[PDB]
Amino acid sequence: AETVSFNFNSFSEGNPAINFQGDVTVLSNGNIQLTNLNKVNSVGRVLYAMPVRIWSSATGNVASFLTSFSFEMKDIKDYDPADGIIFFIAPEDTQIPAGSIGGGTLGVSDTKGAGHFVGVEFDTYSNSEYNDPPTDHVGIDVNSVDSVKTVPWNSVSGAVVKVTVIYDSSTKTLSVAVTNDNGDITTIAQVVDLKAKLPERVKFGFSASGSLGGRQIHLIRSWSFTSTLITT
Protein backbone atom coordinates (compact mmCIF):
# COMPACT_ATOMS: atom_id res chain seq x y z
CA ALA A 1 0.00 0.00 0.00
CA GLU A 2 1.68 3.16 -1.30
CA THR A 3 0.09 6.11 0.47
CA VAL A 4 0.35 9.88 0.31
CA SER A 5 -1.25 12.14 2.88
CA PHE A 6 -0.83 15.53 4.49
CA ASN A 7 -2.86 18.29 6.07
CA PHE A 8 -2.49 22.06 5.82
CA ASN A 9 -4.38 24.21 8.33
CA SER A 10 -2.58 27.23 6.89
CA PHE A 11 0.40 27.88 4.66
CA SER A 12 3.71 29.74 4.75
CA GLU A 13 6.06 30.81 1.99
CA GLY A 14 9.03 28.58 2.56
CA ASN A 15 7.62 25.10 3.04
CA PRO A 16 9.37 23.03 0.35
CA ALA A 17 6.36 20.70 0.37
CA ILE A 18 4.65 23.34 -1.74
CA ASN A 19 5.23 24.45 -5.33
CA PHE A 20 4.27 28.02 -6.15
CA GLN A 21 3.69 29.15 -9.73
CA GLY A 22 2.76 32.53 -11.18
CA ASP A 23 1.33 35.30 -9.00
CA VAL A 24 0.62 33.07 -6.00
CA THR A 25 1.18 34.65 -2.60
CA VAL A 26 0.99 33.68 1.08
CA LEU A 27 -0.79 36.22 3.27
CA SER A 28 0.09 36.98 6.90
CA ASN A 29 -2.85 34.97 8.23
CA GLY A 30 -1.61 31.78 6.61
CA ASN A 31 -3.98 31.90 3.63
CA ILE A 32 -2.82 31.46 0.06
CA GLN A 33 -3.91 34.15 -2.36
CA LEU A 34 -3.75 32.76 -5.88
CA THR A 35 -3.96 35.98 -7.89
CA ASN A 36 -2.51 39.51 -8.02
CA LEU A 37 -5.14 42.28 -8.05
CA ASN A 38 -2.94 44.81 -9.86
CA LYS A 39 -1.94 42.51 -12.73
CA VAL A 40 -3.59 41.79 -16.05
CA ASN A 41 -4.50 38.18 -16.84
CA SER A 42 -3.02 37.21 -13.47
CA VAL A 43 -2.48 33.54 -12.74
CA GLY A 44 -1.25 31.80 -9.63
CA ARG A 45 -1.16 28.09 -8.88
CA VAL A 46 -0.16 26.03 -5.86
CA LEU A 47 0.75 22.32 -6.05
CA TYR A 48 1.85 19.64 -3.62
CA ALA A 49 5.59 19.55 -4.28
CA MET A 50 5.69 15.76 -4.24
CA PRO A 51 4.44 13.77 -7.22
CA VAL A 52 1.74 11.17 -6.59
CA ARG A 53 1.81 7.80 -8.28
CA ILE A 54 -1.91 7.50 -9.17
CA TRP A 55 -1.45 4.34 -11.24
CA SER A 56 1.14 1.70 -12.01
CA SER A 57 1.92 0.47 -15.50
CA ALA A 58 3.24 -2.73 -13.92
CA THR A 59 0.16 -3.79 -11.94
CA GLY A 60 -2.28 -1.58 -13.79
CA ASN A 61 -3.69 -0.70 -10.41
CA VAL A 62 -5.17 2.76 -10.01
CA ALA A 63 -5.27 4.61 -6.70
CA SER A 64 -8.25 6.02 -4.86
CA PHE A 65 -8.21 9.21 -2.86
CA LEU A 66 -9.98 11.46 -0.44
CA THR A 67 -9.38 15.17 -0.08
CA SER A 68 -10.90 18.27 1.47
CA PHE A 69 -10.16 21.95 1.12
CA SER A 70 -11.75 25.34 1.71
CA PHE A 71 -11.49 28.58 -0.24
CA GLU A 72 -12.95 32.06 -0.49
CA MET A 73 -13.70 34.50 -3.29
CA LYS A 74 -14.17 38.05 -2.05
CA ASP A 75 -15.21 40.70 -4.56
CA ILE A 76 -13.28 43.94 -5.05
CA LYS A 77 -14.25 47.16 -6.83
CA ASP A 78 -14.31 47.93 -9.65
CA TYR A 79 -13.51 44.74 -11.53
CA ASP A 80 -15.84 41.95 -12.62
CA PRO A 81 -15.46 39.25 -9.92
CA ALA A 82 -13.88 36.55 -12.11
CA ASP A 83 -12.73 34.05 -13.01
CA GLY A 84 -12.69 31.55 -10.17
CA ILE A 85 -10.74 28.57 -8.88
CA ILE A 86 -10.03 25.02 -9.92
CA PHE A 87 -8.70 22.03 -8.05
CA PHE A 88 -6.87 19.97 -10.63
CA ILE A 89 -4.71 16.95 -11.37
CA ALA A 90 -1.86 17.25 -13.90
CA PRO A 91 1.45 15.66 -15.01
CA GLU A 92 4.32 16.42 -12.63
CA ASP A 93 6.00 18.60 -15.28
CA THR A 94 2.93 20.86 -15.32
CA GLN A 95 3.43 24.63 -15.57
CA ILE A 96 1.14 27.58 -16.29
CA PRO A 97 0.46 27.52 -20.05
CA ALA A 98 2.88 29.55 -22.18
CA GLY A 99 1.51 33.03 -22.67
CA SER A 100 -1.62 32.36 -20.62
CA ILE A 101 -4.47 34.89 -20.83
CA GLY A 102 -5.86 33.59 -17.58
CA GLY A 103 -9.50 34.57 -17.63
CA GLY A 104 -11.80 31.64 -18.31
CA THR A 105 -8.87 29.21 -18.69
CA LEU A 106 -8.48 29.20 -14.91
CA GLY A 107 -4.75 29.02 -15.52
CA VAL A 108 -4.78 25.41 -16.73
CA SER A 109 -5.39 25.68 -20.47
CA ASP A 110 -4.68 27.55 -23.67
CA THR A 111 -7.05 29.95 -25.35
CA LYS A 112 -8.97 27.18 -27.11
CA GLY A 113 -9.57 25.96 -23.57
CA ALA A 114 -7.69 22.70 -23.83
CA GLY A 115 -4.78 21.32 -21.85
CA HIS A 116 -3.45 18.22 -20.12
CA PHE A 117 -5.29 17.83 -16.78
CA VAL A 118 -8.37 16.82 -14.76
CA GLY A 119 -10.19 19.18 -12.43
CA VAL A 120 -13.15 20.43 -10.41
CA GLU A 121 -13.74 24.07 -11.28
CA PHE A 122 -15.57 26.81 -9.44
CA ASP A 123 -16.68 29.27 -12.10
CA THR A 124 -17.77 32.81 -11.32
CA TYR A 125 -17.99 34.05 -14.91
CA SER A 126 -19.96 32.67 -17.86
CA ASN A 127 -17.40 32.29 -20.66
CA SER A 128 -19.49 31.64 -23.77
CA GLU A 129 -16.38 30.62 -25.68
CA TYR A 130 -16.05 27.58 -23.40
CA ASN A 131 -19.76 26.69 -23.49
CA ASP A 132 -20.20 27.95 -19.94
CA PRO A 133 -23.54 27.75 -18.15
CA PRO A 134 -25.32 31.11 -17.69
CA THR A 135 -24.91 31.21 -13.90
CA ASP A 136 -22.04 30.46 -11.50
CA HIS A 137 -21.24 26.76 -11.41
CA VAL A 138 -19.17 23.74 -10.47
CA GLY A 139 -17.75 21.60 -13.23
CA ILE A 140 -15.77 18.45 -13.85
CA ASP A 141 -13.01 19.13 -16.35
CA VAL A 142 -10.99 16.72 -18.49
CA ASN A 143 -8.34 18.20 -20.79
CA SER A 144 -10.68 21.16 -21.24
CA VAL A 145 -12.33 24.08 -19.45
CA ASP A 146 -15.44 23.20 -21.46
CA SER A 147 -16.63 21.03 -18.57
CA VAL A 148 -17.70 17.45 -19.26
CA LYS A 149 -20.42 18.20 -16.71
CA THR A 150 -21.44 21.17 -14.55
CA VAL A 151 -24.00 21.95 -11.86
CA PRO A 152 -25.56 25.30 -10.85
CA TRP A 153 -23.96 26.93 -7.80
CA ASN A 154 -23.39 30.43 -6.43
CA SER A 155 -20.24 32.08 -5.14
CA VAL A 156 -21.08 34.35 -2.20
CA SER A 157 -18.56 37.18 -1.85
CA GLY A 158 -16.54 36.75 1.34
CA ALA A 159 -18.00 33.31 2.05
CA VAL A 160 -15.92 30.33 3.06
CA VAL A 161 -16.67 27.21 1.05
CA LYS A 162 -16.04 23.64 2.14
CA VAL A 163 -15.29 21.02 -0.47
CA THR A 164 -14.82 17.27 -0.32
CA VAL A 165 -13.67 15.12 -3.22
CA ILE A 166 -13.63 11.35 -3.42
CA TYR A 167 -12.09 9.34 -6.23
CA ASP A 168 -12.88 5.65 -6.34
CA SER A 169 -10.57 3.67 -8.63
CA SER A 170 -12.86 0.64 -8.96
CA THR A 171 -15.51 2.75 -10.67
CA LYS A 172 -13.37 5.67 -11.86
CA THR A 173 -15.92 7.86 -10.13
CA LEU A 174 -15.01 11.39 -9.06
CA SER A 175 -17.36 12.75 -6.39
CA VAL A 176 -17.63 16.31 -5.17
CA ALA A 177 -19.66 17.63 -2.25
CA VAL A 178 -19.68 21.41 -1.92
CA THR A 179 -21.02 23.04 1.22
CA ASN A 180 -22.10 26.64 0.85
CA ASP A 181 -22.29 29.44 3.40
CA ASN A 182 -25.93 28.65 4.25
CA GLY A 183 -25.28 24.98 5.08
CA ASP A 184 -26.72 23.85 1.75
CA ILE A 185 -24.71 21.15 -0.06
CA THR A 186 -24.29 20.92 -3.82
CA THR A 187 -22.92 17.84 -5.59
CA ILE A 188 -21.59 16.60 -8.88
CA ALA A 189 -20.14 13.19 -9.73
CA GLN A 190 -18.61 11.90 -12.97
CA VAL A 191 -16.80 8.84 -14.26
CA VAL A 192 -13.32 9.97 -15.25
CA ASP A 193 -10.71 7.37 -16.12
CA LEU A 194 -7.49 8.85 -14.72
CA LYS A 195 -5.25 6.01 -15.96
CA ALA A 196 -6.48 6.87 -19.44
CA LYS A 197 -6.17 10.64 -19.10
CA LEU A 198 -2.99 11.22 -17.06
CA PRO A 199 0.50 9.74 -16.60
CA GLU A 200 1.42 7.36 -13.79
CA ARG A 201 2.83 10.26 -11.76
CA VAL A 202 1.04 13.57 -11.20
CA LYS A 203 0.67 16.65 -9.02
CA PHE A 204 -2.44 18.02 -7.34
CA GLY A 205 -3.10 21.69 -6.77
CA PHE A 206 -5.13 24.85 -7.14
CA SER A 207 -5.22 27.49 -9.85
CA ALA A 208 -7.02 30.83 -10.06
CA SER A 209 -6.98 33.49 -12.76
CA GLY A 210 -8.32 36.87 -13.83
CA SER A 211 -7.92 39.22 -16.80
CA LEU A 212 -8.25 42.87 -17.82
CA GLY A 213 -11.60 43.82 -16.30
CA GLY A 214 -12.19 40.57 -14.41
CA ARG A 215 -10.41 40.32 -11.05
CA GLN A 216 -11.09 39.12 -7.50
CA ILE A 217 -9.49 37.69 -4.40
CA HIS A 218 -8.91 33.96 -4.55
CA LEU A 219 -7.99 32.42 -1.22
CA ILE A 220 -7.20 28.78 -0.51
CA ARG A 221 -7.55 28.33 3.24
CA SER A 222 -7.07 24.64 4.06
CA TRP A 223 -6.30 21.31 2.43
CA SER A 224 -6.01 17.73 3.70
CA PHE A 225 -5.27 14.85 1.36
CA THR A 226 -4.71 11.11 1.23
CA SER A 227 -4.08 8.77 -1.68
CA THR A 228 -3.57 5.03 -1.71
CA LEU A 229 -2.30 2.83 -4.51
CA ILE A 230 -2.56 -0.92 -3.97
CA THR A 231 0.65 -2.69 -4.93
CA THR A 232 -0.42 -6.31 -4.41
Ligand X SMILES: OC[C@H]1O[C@H](OC[C@H]2O[C@@H](O)[C@H](O)[C@@H](O)[C@@H]2O)[C@H](O)[C@@H](O)[C@H]1O
Ligand Y SMILES: OC[C@H]1O[C@H](O)[C@H](O)[C@@H](O)[C@H]1O
Q: What residue numbers does the annotated binding site for Ca(2+) cover? A: 123, 125, 127, 132
Q: Strand 201-209 relative to strand 219-229: parallel, antiparallel, unpaired?
A: unpaired
For 75, residues 6+ apart whose C-beta sits below 8 A from its C-beta are 81, 157, 158, 216, 217
The answer to whether 179 contacts a second copy (rule: CB under 8 A) is yes
The answer to whether 175 contacts a second copy (rule: CB under 8 A) is yes
Q: Which among 79-87, 153-161, 164-172, 217-225 is the span making contact with ligand Y, rule CB under 6 A?
A: 79-87
- C-beta closer to a second copy: residue 114 or 166: 166
Among 111, 143, 144, 228, the residue binding a second copy under the rule CB under 8 A is 228
C-alpha atoms less than 13 angstroms from C-alpha of 210 in its C-beta half-sphere: 27
Distance CA 23, CA 63 (A): 31
Distance CA 22, CA 35 (A): 8
Footprint of Mn ion on residues 124-183 (CB under 5 A)? 132, 139, 147
Among 94, 147, 169, 211, the residue binding ligand Y under the rule CB under 6 A is 211
Q: Strand 84-91 relative to strand 114-123: parallel, antiparallel, unpaired?
A: antiparallel
Distance CA 51, CA 34 (A): 21
CA angle (63 as vertex; 192, 191 as ends), nearest 5: 15
Q: Which among 28-36, 42-50, 63-71, 208-216 is the span making contact with ligand Y, rule CB under 6 A?
A: 208-216
Total binding residues toward ligand Y, as defined by CB under 6 A? 11
Footprint of ligand Y on residues 82-101 (CB under 6 A)? 82-83
- C-beta closer to ligand X: residue 83 or 136: 83
Min separation Cβ 217 and ligand Y, Å: 14
DSSP-derived 3-state class of residue 159: coil
Residue 103: contacted member of Mn ion, Ca ion, ligand Y, none (CB under 5 to 8 Å, by partner type): ligand Y
- Quick check: 84 and 103 in contact, CB under 8 A? no
Whose CA is closest to 90, among 198, 172, 208, 229? 198
Residues that bind a second copy (CB under 8 A): 1-7, 9-10, 12, 14-17, 25, 27-31, 33, 37, 49-53, 56, 58, 64-66, 72, 74, 149, 151, 157-158, 160, 164, 166-171, 173, 175-177, 179, 182-190, 201, 217, 219, 221-222, 226-228, 231
